[PDB]
RNA sequence: GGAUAAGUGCUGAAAGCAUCUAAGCAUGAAGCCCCCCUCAAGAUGAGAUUUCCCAUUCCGCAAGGAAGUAAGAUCCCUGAA
RNA sequence: UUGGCACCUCGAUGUCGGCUCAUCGCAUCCUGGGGCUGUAGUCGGUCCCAAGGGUUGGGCUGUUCGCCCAUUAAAGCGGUACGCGAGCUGGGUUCAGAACGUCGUGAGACAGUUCGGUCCCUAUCCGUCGCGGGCGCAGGAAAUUUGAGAGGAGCUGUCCUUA
């Protein structure tokens, strides 16, 4: 007979910064958040998460050779039909989807992952409008 | 034996400026150059001796010990010298004059060629066959001069076109 | 950087001071008033609205009315939007007549191109047919759907459906003559566009 | 139960690791990951449990 | 060119250089310029 | 136009020289992404401006509900671009 | 591809060749870029980067292939149930009818040959082309758009000038 809180939660805004880390493991515990599997009033079926803005994600890093490698590969269903974008493709044309699409794949899917996935947004730059809800300052374990 | 490990030395009128982490301008007569470094390397400077030191003894420490010396080498010459590369053309209806700075190229083409220098690089045309581009910059003067040459290579048949002081041609003999 | 927008009517054939005949539409544009200058520090972009018909007191809406009534010139029909214009040099209300163009340059026109209903598979995507003797009982018909195994027909393949309709545009024409006097502009080319349709005269990118 | 555990860890800097293993030499307490959640939500009095393995991790 | 997996020097005065992650004879002669891959 | 592929380059070590390299740059194709054109906010991330209509009558304690309207739209009817 | 193995299919998976609609890979036939050349120049040979676009019209053959005629800048190869028969044709083998040669005393045979021979269906679901009705879009309604995102188009020869 546990505990299973459904909708009595009280949420939360972090915001976690993209100074000068790697996407993965930048990605790696707000995915964690976006679920707030943290937090210990953890069902695994209501959406216990809180909200996350990152900001300045334009300006995230990657060792290796992976500025010119990992090509991010979206698909139509027109017959031949795949548009190949290279990672800083993506990292200067746009990069409003280069964390989206980090954490797309981070969350886990059925129709309550689009439900957490409603919690996430990303701002270039340091824009931040979010005047309005007093946003928390987190720091990940590493 | 090793191009790093001796010194580098101020002759007279240049001011070598370690200013920033690696943003290091040295002024003087020919002109004033900048250049960003390694912030591994450790480049400290004596009374007008240049002295530039490693933490280690890796792959990249063997790299960058030579080459940030031997660039502040060149970054000497082209302050208190300068550079310039001469460009003979050779053959017949070849020539080249200057419009103000705009290079005219009135080489082999049913049009003439313009050549701009961007950067303030002297070019210097002394007649219709010599093209000297003189400068401060190695990686300047030596890249404006080669795409120079990218207008007309030379042909080792009949040697032709662009071509620089003492470039020896190779000189195929087709019938 | 410009445009004014007018009405079709049909075809003539004007001599241009030669024995040069050339094919000749008549486009009419009653003298258009910008209704809206959309500014890019409110709008974000860059852009301006014309208007054109005289429209009468039963067809007008409420808010058909206050939005031209702002720069109060008239209620006009049909509103379209150009971008990319110089807007230093217009202002709200102001009246464009023919006074634009001249009768020898490069004009761009678009519009909205006439209709075939439901016609199928051989005049809506020019296709060919089979053969109409040696005993086949095929003829007029879409041609194969695709192989076996990828168990679906791709989104790319065409088929019967509803021929014409949409928006058309014809790249790099030219004025044949200027007629401002009646508010005519004569453009050398066949133009899309039934009788009383309407249509963007810009100036095309050469 | 576990993830809940790992959960009042991290309020704590501990594992979930150094929880359970803390545990079998903290006491050799038997706390069942069911009922050691029902600790949780009395997490002022959880941490007497956490931190008492924690000096029995040192 | 000659483009081909086993790359060896020829000549005396053939320079065997690892360029650009493949590996290249630089010499003189241009006939001897052999790449792999 | 932008960034590259093969090349073609400079500069320049490791490895006093040489070296189109590891740093630092420039070129370079009917390729690639925009530029051209059409479609497109159900882009559930549902955008953005322009004006109009305004906060009415009843339950009900509220929550909520229905029942006449505004702006406009429909049934219907003469119609074919 | 010629083939091995007999695993699914003999309470049926209709099989070659053309017509219809094309789509996909790159070991490229043209077009773009180049490197070397026994590359004078004009043609060329050869590897390399290239898949965005194109790839002719006929006589014979059931033809695929190939020969041939005539062009073209080029006449690419290979999939995709040797693509496509609930889209089409039935010439081809492979039904009995007929005949020739040979085999067999014989009935009859023959991937040897010749002549003639019914190709069925009204579309549930997914899938496409097109159109619409509802609600959504924390008020209702009227017009115009930014553009997420997609698609189409993306081939080139002769001649003039430089000369």
Same mark, same amino acid.
């Given at each position: 007979?546990?505990?299973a809180?459904a909708?009595?939660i $009280?949420?939360?805004?972090?915001?976690?910064?993209?100074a000068?880390?790697?996407?993965?493991?930048?990605?790696?515990?707000?995915?964690?958040?976006?679920?707030?599997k943290?937090?210990?009033?953890?069902?695994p079926?209501?959406?216990?998460?809180? *909200?996350?803005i990152?900001?300045?994600?334009?300006?995230?890093e990657?060792?290796?050779?992976?500025?010119?490698?990992?090509?991010?590969?979206?698909?139509?269903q027109?017959?031949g039909?795949?548009?190949?974008?290279?990672?800083?493709?993506?990292?200067?044309?746009?990069?409003?989807?280069?964390?989206?699409?980090?954490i797309?794949?981070?969350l886990?899917?059925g129709?309550?992952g689009?439900?957490?996935?409603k919690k996430?947004n990303?701002?270039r730059?340091?824009?931040?409008? *979010? $005047?309005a809800?007093?946003?928390?300052?987190?720091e990940?374990?590493? | 034996?090793?191009?790093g490990?001796?010194?580098?030395?101020?002759?007279?009128?240049?001011?070598?400026?370690?200013?920033?982490?690696?943003?290091?301008?040295?002024?003087?007569?020919?002109?004033?150059?900048?250049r960003?470094?390694?912030?591994?390397?450790?480049?400290?400077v004596?009374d007008?001796?240049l002295?530039?030191?490693?933490?280690?003894?890796?792959?990249?420490?063997? &790299?960058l010990?030579?080459?940030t010396?031997?660039?502040?080498?060149?970054?000497?010459?082209?302050?208190?010298?300068?550079?310039?590369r001469?460009?003979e053309?050779?053959?017949?209806?070849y020539?080249?004059?200057?419009?103000?700075?705009?290079?005219?190229?009135?080489?082999?083409?049913?049009?003439?060629?313009?050549?701009?220098?961007?950067?303030?690089?002297?070019?210097?045309?002394?007649?219709?066959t010599?093209?000297?581009?003189?400068?401060?910059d190695?990686?300047?003067?030596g890249? /404006? &001069?080669?795409? /120079?040459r &990218?207008?007309?290579?030379?042909?080792?048949?009949?040697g032709?076109?662009?071509?620089?002081?003492?470039?020896?041609?190779?000189?195929?003999?087709?019938? | 950087?410009?445009?004014?927008?007018?009405?079709?009517?049909?075809?003539?054939?004007?001599? !241009?001071?030669?024995?040069?005949?050339?094919?000749?539409? %008549?486009?009419?544009?009653?003298?258009?008033?910008?209704?809206?200058?959309?500014? !890019?520090?409110?709008?974000?972009?860059?852009?301006?609205?014309?208007?054109?018909?005289?429209?009468?007191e039963?067809?007008?809406?409420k808010?058909?009315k206050?939005?031209?009534?702002?720069?109060?010139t008239?209620?006009?029909?049909?509103?379209?939007?150009?971008?990319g214009?110089?807007?230093?040099?217009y202002?709200?209300?102001?009246?464009?007549?023919?006074?634009?163009?001249?009768?020898?340059?490069?004009?761009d %026109?678009?519009?909205?191109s006439?209709?075939?209903?439901?016609?199928?598979?051989?005049?809506?995507?020019?296709?060919?047919?089979? #053969?109409?003797?040696?005993?086949?009982?095929?003829?007029?018909?879409?041609?194969?759907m695709?192989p076996?195994?990828?168990?679906?027909?791709?989104?790319?393949?065409?088929?019967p459906?509803?021929?014409?309709?949409?928006?058309?545009?014809?790249?790099?024409?030219?004025?044949?003559?200027?007629?401002?006097?009646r508010?005519?502009?004569?453009?050398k080319?066949? %133009? #899309?566009?039934?009788?009383?349709?309407?249509?963007?005269v810009?100036?095309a %990118?050469? | 139960w576990?993830?809940?555990?790992?959960?009042?860890?991290?309020?704590?800097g +501990?594992?979930y690791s150094?929880?359970?293993?803390?545990?079998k +030499?903290?006491?050799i307490?038997?706390?069942?990951?069911?009922?050691a =959640?029902?600790?949780?939500? =009395?997490?002022?009095?959880?941490?007497?449990?956490? =931190?008492?393995?924690?000096?029995?991790?040192? | 060119?000659?483009?081909?997996?086993s790359?060896?020097?020829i000549?005396?005065?053939?320079?065997?250089?690892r360029?650009?992650?493949?590996?290249?004879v630089?010499?003189?002669?241009?006939?001897?310029?052999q790449?792999?891959?």
């Open positions: 007979t546990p505990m809180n909708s009595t $009280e949420r939360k805004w972090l915001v976690v910064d993209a000068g880390k790697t996407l993965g493991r930048l990605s790696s515990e707000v995915a964690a958040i976006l679920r707030g943290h937090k210990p009033t953890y069902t079926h209501v959406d216990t998460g809180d *909200h996350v990152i900001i300045n994600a334009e300006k995230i990657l060792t290796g050779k992976k500025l010119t490698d990992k090509i991010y590969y979206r698909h139509t027109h017959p039909g795949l548009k190949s974008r290279t990672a800083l493709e993506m990292r200067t044309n746009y990069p409003e989807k280069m964390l989206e699409l980090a797309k794949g981070m886990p899917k129709s309550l689009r439900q957490m996935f996430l990303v701002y730059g340091s824009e931040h409008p *979010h $005047e809800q007093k946003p928390e300052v987190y990940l374990r590493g | 034996s090793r191009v490990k001796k010194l580098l030395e101020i002759p007279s009128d240049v001011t070598v400026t370690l200013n920033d982490n690696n943003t290091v301008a040295v002024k003087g007569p020919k002109g004033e150059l900048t960003t470094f390694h912030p591994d390397m450790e480049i400290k004596e007008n001796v002295t530039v030191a490693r933490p280690s003894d890796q792959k990249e420490h063997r &790299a010990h030579g080459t010396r031997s660039l502040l080498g060149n970054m000497v010459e082209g302050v208190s010298k300068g550079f310039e001469g460009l053309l050779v053959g017949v209806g020539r080249a004059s200057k419009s103000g700075n705009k290079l005219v190229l009135n080489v082999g083409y049913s049009h003439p060629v313009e050549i701009v220098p961007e950067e303030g690089i002297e070019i210097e045309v002394p007649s219709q010599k093209v000297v581009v003189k400068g401060t190695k990686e300047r003067v890249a /404006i &001069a080669a795409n /120079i &990218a207008v007309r290579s030379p042909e080792p048949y009949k032709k076109g662009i071509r620089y002081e003492g470039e020896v041609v190779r000189r195929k003999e087709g019938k | 950087t410009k445009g004014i927008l007018g009405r079709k009517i049909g075809m003539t054939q004007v001599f !241009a001071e030669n024995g040069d005949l050339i094919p000749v539409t %008549v486009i009419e544009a009653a003298p258009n008033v910008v209704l809206q200058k959309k500014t !890019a520090e409110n709008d974000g972009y860059e852009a301006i609205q014309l208007g054109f018909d005289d429209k009468r039963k067809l007008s809406n808010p058909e206050g939005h031209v009534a702002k720069a109060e008239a209620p006009k029909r049909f509103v379209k939007e150009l971008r214009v110089e807007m230093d040099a202002e709200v209300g102001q009246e464009v007549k023919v006074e634009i163009f001249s009768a020898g340059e490069i004009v %026109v678009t519009g909205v006439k209709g075939k209903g439901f016609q199928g598979a051989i005049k809506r995507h020019g296709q060919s047919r089979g #053969p109409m003797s040696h005993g086949s009982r095929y003829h007029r018909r879409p041609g194969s695709g076996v195994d990828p168990n679906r027909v791709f989104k790319g393949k065409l088929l459906g509803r021929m014409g309709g949409e928006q058309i545009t014809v790249q790099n024409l030219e004025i044949v003559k200027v007629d401002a006097e508010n005519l502009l004569l453009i080319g066949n %133009v #899309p566009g039934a009788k009383k349709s309407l249509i963007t810009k100036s %990118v050469k | 576990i993830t809940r555990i790992n959960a009042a860890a991290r309020m704590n +501990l594992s150094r929880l359970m293993h803390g545990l +030499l903290s006491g307490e038997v706390n069942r990951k069911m009922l =959640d029902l600790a949780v939500n =009395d997490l002022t009095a959880f941490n007497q449990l956490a =931190d008492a393995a924690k000096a029995q991790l040192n | 060119m000659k483009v081909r997996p790359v060896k020097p000549c005396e005065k053939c320079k065997v250089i360029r650009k992650g493949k590996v290249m630089i010499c003189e002669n241009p006939k001897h310029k790449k792999q891959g």
